[PDB]
Amino acid sequence: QSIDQLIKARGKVYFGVATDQNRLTTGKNAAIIQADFGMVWPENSMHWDATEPSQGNFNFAGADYLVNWAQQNGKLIGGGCLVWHRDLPSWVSSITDKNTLTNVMKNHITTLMTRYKGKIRNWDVVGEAFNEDGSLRQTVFLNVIGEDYIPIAFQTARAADPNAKLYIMDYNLDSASYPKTQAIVNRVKQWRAAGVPIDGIGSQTHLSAGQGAGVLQALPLLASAGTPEVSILMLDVAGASPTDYVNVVNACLNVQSCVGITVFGVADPDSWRASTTPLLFDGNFNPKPAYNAIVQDLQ
């Protein structure tokens, strides 16, 4: 049974998965995505290292493949993070002039978003912008541009594609008493009051065993920032306990503004932490107990 169809029947938008070209041509990933998932996200092909490895010169082959595949198969598409610090090409991190870096950041956002204008439901515009204590992470963008880089990024994105839902995303937002969770709420509320077009908060949910229960309190707290949408992104759970996965799904169901959930791959051996077997399909592409528990919970 399709968890995407079942979550749509409960009033949500999608159950999604991260993938890319070489996943779609190997294993059983294409067949499982066709049957069971409603949105695809690029595992790597839209990050800055993959798309603009030298200035103004864009690499679109991998991203184009994914977008085409999704359109041919009737799937929604999420757009990978436009502005973050992870694996940034060195040409970006060596810029020290505020005007130049602002122009570079705007060009990167506008070029990607324009290419797929109208085809992408939601873009992760800024990612991983917070330290664990809730202060802003001192990346090249913060150091050179200042804290206005976040408003500028969102305003530029809204102009490039008004159809898309624009998200800020971060990890370790899984507990309502952790400082980072309240800090992103505080800042998103302030940005929205200033008219910054942040449509969503995306929670990059990488859980250890037993941490699913806390999402039932953290996700409503994230929703108190007043964004139109929230989502659960990049989900994986060490051990893949049914209890943990069902708790995350029910957090989504309980929060009216939570539009959907995306899991961080199809089958355990293709996870970035495969030794924790944290996904919904095993190494033979069989649905694991957590998959069936989600099916029953949604019924």
Ligand SMILES: O=[N+]([O-])c1ccc2nn[nH]c2c1
């Ligand atoms: O939800 N996702 O699995 C996901 C995967 C890669 C991404 N890059 N940016 N946002 C992302 C979300």
